[PDB]
């Protein structure tokens, strides 16, 4: 807000200086495997397994992502895993997960983050059904500020979905999974993301920019307030078919202000897409749907969260689904050491 737009511009100029110093000088092997006791698996994905861990020497719990180097290789994720780690240690925002330590050994790569105990937003959304517009707006505003922050550092995030958003103690979001995140000034071409959330430009095999994230926010707001994603089917081939068509049907209960904003984000013509216009983010921020949002209070965490998760002591994992436990083997021979030398 004029004075506030200046404060934001000046903020970001300075945060950019901090990001560059860490991006240019990354921290390496800040721990080893044996300082940690592995409690249980908090969640899994196509690539990694995150575990609740305890530091033996300090009694502190963290969340540890484990990637098998032989799998990173077969899945074509070498440069992506290196981006993930390099960006995550250089970033610093209230809504993003904190990377404490990282290290590797003969078999795996390890990233040790702050343990976010409230569960995935996914969990809570599916249990409850759908969120109310004011609840949906509370979270959308956090992601709006996060993207503004990331994009100004020349970063595309690329995997926005309820499964990658976690709920902290205060009921505020922490974005995890930087696996597709990339510092890029021009266009980029990798087919990557999650089916329902893919912008039509990715599907179409076109170069894309930071607008993919804004499309993803349209998909996320729709899913949080309807309780289902705008484009769904049984097979991925059917969702893509739907994405590219461009036809969105809103539930009757969405406000006209909500439908207006989503038509602006779920804009198939990246030219007309909000967040990619001359004004950028201020289009989304000054939308009538966010007229009540005090962007500063949300940034400062001064707003009372609509939902607070309950826990009963540390390592308390009740907010997460249960997963089958795998034993993690470390080979007697170093696997793919050349490809991961900077990690």
């Amino acid at each position: 807000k004029g004075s506030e737009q200046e404060s934001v511009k000046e903020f970001l100029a300075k945060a950019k200086e901090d990001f560059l110093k860490k991006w240019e000088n990354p921290a390496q092997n800040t721990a080893h495997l044996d300082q940690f006791e592995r409690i249980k698996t908090l969640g899994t994905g196509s690539f990694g397994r995150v575990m609740l861990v305890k530091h033996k020497e300090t009694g502190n719990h963290f969340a540890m992502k484990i990637l098998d180097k032989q799998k990173v290789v077969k899945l074509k994720q070498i440069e992506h895993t290196l981006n993930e780690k390099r960006i995550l240690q250089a970033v610093n925002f209230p809504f993003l997960v904190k990377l404490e330590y990282s290290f590797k050994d003969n078999s795996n790569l390890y990233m040790v983050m702050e343990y976010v105990p409230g569960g995935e937003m996914f969990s809570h959304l599916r249990r409850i059904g759908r969120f109310s517009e004011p609840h949906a707006r509370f979270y959308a505003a956090q992601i709006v500020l996060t993207f503004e922050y990331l994009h100004s550092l020349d970063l595309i995030y690329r995997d926005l979905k309820p499964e990658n958003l976690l709920i902290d103690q205060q009921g505020y979001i922490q974005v995890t999974d930087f696996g597709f995140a990339k510092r890029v000034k021009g266009r980029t071409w990798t087919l990557c993301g999650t089916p329902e959330y893919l912008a039509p430009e990715i599907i179409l095999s076109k170069g894309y920019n930071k607008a993919v994230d804004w499309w993803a926010l349209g998909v996320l707001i729709y899913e949080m307030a309807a309780g289902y994603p705008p484009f769904f089917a049984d097979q991925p081939i059917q969702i893509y078919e739907k994405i590219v068509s461009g036809k969105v049907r809103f539930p009757s209960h969405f406000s006209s202000d909500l439908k207006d904003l989503l038509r602006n984000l779920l804009q198939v013509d990246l030219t007309k897409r909000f967040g990619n216009l001359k004004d950028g983010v201020n289009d989304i921020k000054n939308h009538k749907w966010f007229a009540t949002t005090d962007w500063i209070a949300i940034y400062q965490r001064k707003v009372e969260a609509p939902f607070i998760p309950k826990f009963k002591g540390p390592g308390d994992t009740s907010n997460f689904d249960d997963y089958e436990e795998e034993e993690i083997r470390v080979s007697i021979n170093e696997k793919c050491g050349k490809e991961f030398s900077e990690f």
Binding site: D159, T194, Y228, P236
Partner: peptide
């Protein structure tokens, strides 16, 4: 209802990233 068709679908569980 659309909620009904979605709840009966194949993709109502945690959705993993594309890799293939």
């Amino acid at each position: 209802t659309t909620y009904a068709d979605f709840i009966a679908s194949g993709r109502t569980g945690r959705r993993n990233a594309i890799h293939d």
